[PDB]
Design a protein around this ligand. Sequence first.
Ligand SMILES: CN(C)CCOc1ccc([C@H]2C[C@]3(C)[C@@H](O)CC[C@H]3[C@@H]3CCc4cc(O)ccc4[C@H]32)cc1
Ligand SMILES: CN(C)CCOc1ccc([C@H]2C[C@]3(C)[C@@H](O)CC[C@H]3[C@@H]3CCc4cc(O)ccc4[C@H]32)cc1
Lengths: 223, 222
Amino acid sequence: ALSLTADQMVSALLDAEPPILYSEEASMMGLLTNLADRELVHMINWAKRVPGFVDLTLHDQVHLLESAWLEILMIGLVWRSMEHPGKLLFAPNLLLDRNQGKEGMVEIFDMLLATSSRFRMMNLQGEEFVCLKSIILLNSGVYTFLSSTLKSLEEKDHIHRVLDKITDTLIHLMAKAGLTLQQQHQRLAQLLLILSHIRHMSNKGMEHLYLSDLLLEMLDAHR
Amino acid sequence: ALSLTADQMVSALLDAEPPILYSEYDPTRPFSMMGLLTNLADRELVHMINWAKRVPGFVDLTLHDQVHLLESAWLEILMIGLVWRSMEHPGKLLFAPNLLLDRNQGKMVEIFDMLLATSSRFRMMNLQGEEFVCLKSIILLNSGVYTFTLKSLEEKDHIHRVLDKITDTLIHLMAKAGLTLQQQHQRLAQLLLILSHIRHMSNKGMEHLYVPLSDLLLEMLD
Ligand SMILES: CN(C)CCOc1ccc([C@H]2C[C@]3(C)[C@@H](O)CC[C@H]3[C@@H]3CCc4cc(O)ccc4[C@H]32)cc1
Ligand SMILES: CN(C)CCOc1ccc([C@H]2C[C@]3(C)[C@@H](O)CC[C@H]3[C@@H]3CCc4cc(O)ccc4[C@H]32)cc1
C-alpha cells in the first residue's frame, strides 16, 4: 500500500469502483432502502480493495465502515447526481427532485443537491472523487477507536500513513491538471472541507433513520 | 482581507483571540455541572462574536449571512477552543481554569471521550498556536457556507476567496517551520480532516443539547 505510486493508487481505486445499481409516493422509502442495502454489499467489496484497508484487524475494518457507510453512500449519490441539476440520481431509473422528498427528508435532499451543485461548479473529476471516497472510509472512524492497546496505535499509524499517500495522490492529480502549487493546495483544502459537510449530512441522515454484526459477517470471509 | 500577507493574517488572528473565562461558582462552597457549563458557554459566545468581527473578511458579509455562519459554527468553535486549551492536560478537559474535569466527572460521556481524543491528536501533531487560529477561522467561514440570488453567489465567492487566503497562510506557516512541500500538503490535509471530526462532535452536542439563537446573535453583532 505505502509503496504505490500516485498513478498506481489512482489505478487501484478506479479499478475498485462498485457498479451502479438499479432500483427494484408510499413505496419510495422502501425502494431507497432496498437499493441502499444492495449497495452496502458492494461497498464491502470496494473497501477490501482500497489499499491498506485489509491490512487492518477485522474489528477495525468494521469500526471504519460502521462510521463511514452512510457518508460513502451519500458521496456516491452526489457524484452520480452531479450532471443532473436539481435532481438526485439514486439509480438510473430512480431520479428524484425535491418535491418527491417532501418526514425531515427535504432538508437532507437540499443539502445533497447543494453538494452536487458544488461538485459541478468545481468540475470534480472522477479520479478526485475516488480519492475523496477512500479518505472518508479511512478517516471518519479513526478518532473513535475507543482503545489504545499497542495494536490500536499501530493500526492508527498505518491508516494515517495511507491517508498521507492519498493526499499525495490528490496533489499529483492536480499537478497533472496543470494547476499552480497555490491552486493545488487551495483545491485540496476546498475538497477536504466538503468532507465536513458530508459528515453533517450523514449525521442528519442517521437521525432520520433513528449493523456491525452484518458488516463483520460480510467482512469476515473464509478462503 | 484579500490583500493581507500571510504574516499579517496570522497577526490579525492572534490579536483577535478571545479571553479565557472562568466558571461562575463559589470556590469557598460545596461542589450543578450542566448549569455551570451552560452559563460558561453563554458568556463565551459573546466574546466569540467579537472575535468573528475581527476575522479578516467576515464583516464584509451581510448581517444575515454573518448570523447564518455563526449559527452553524458556534458549537464547533467552542469545542475547538476547549480542545486547544486542554491540550497540556492529558485525560482532562479545561472548560475553565477553575473547572478542569476528567472522564468520571463528565458523567456527556461519549462526547467527553471524543473531545479528549481530539485533544490527544492535537498534542500528538504538536499543533501550533498560529495553526489553531487558522483552523478556527476556517470553521467559522466553512461551516455554514453550504446551507445559505446574485448577492448570495457573490457572498459565497467572497467566503471561498477568504478561505483560500487562510489555506495560503497555513501553508506559509508550515513552510516557515521547515516542512517540505510534501510535508506541507500532508499536514494541511491532516488538520482539515480533524475538522470533520469536530463537526461530528458538534452534531452530537446539538443532539445531546436537545427567542431564536439568530436573534441573540444579531443583537450581539449589532
Ligand atoms: C443499509 N441498511 C442496513 C440501512 C438502511 O440504509 C439506508 C436506507 C435508506 C437510505 C436512503 C433514505 C435516506 C436515509 C432518507 O431517509 C434521508 C437520507 C436518505 C439517503 C440518502 C443517501 C442514499 C444513498 C443511496 O445510494 C441510497 C439511498 C440513500 C438514502 C439510505 C441508507
Ligand atoms: C450557547 N447557548 C445559546 C446554548 C447553550 O450552549 C452550550 C451549553 C453547554 C455546553 C457544554 C455542555 C455540552 C453541550 C454537553 O451537554 C455535551 C457537549 C458539551 C459542550 C462541549 C463544548 C463546550 C465548550 C465550552 O467552552 C463550554 C461548554 C461546552 C459544553 C456547550 C454549549
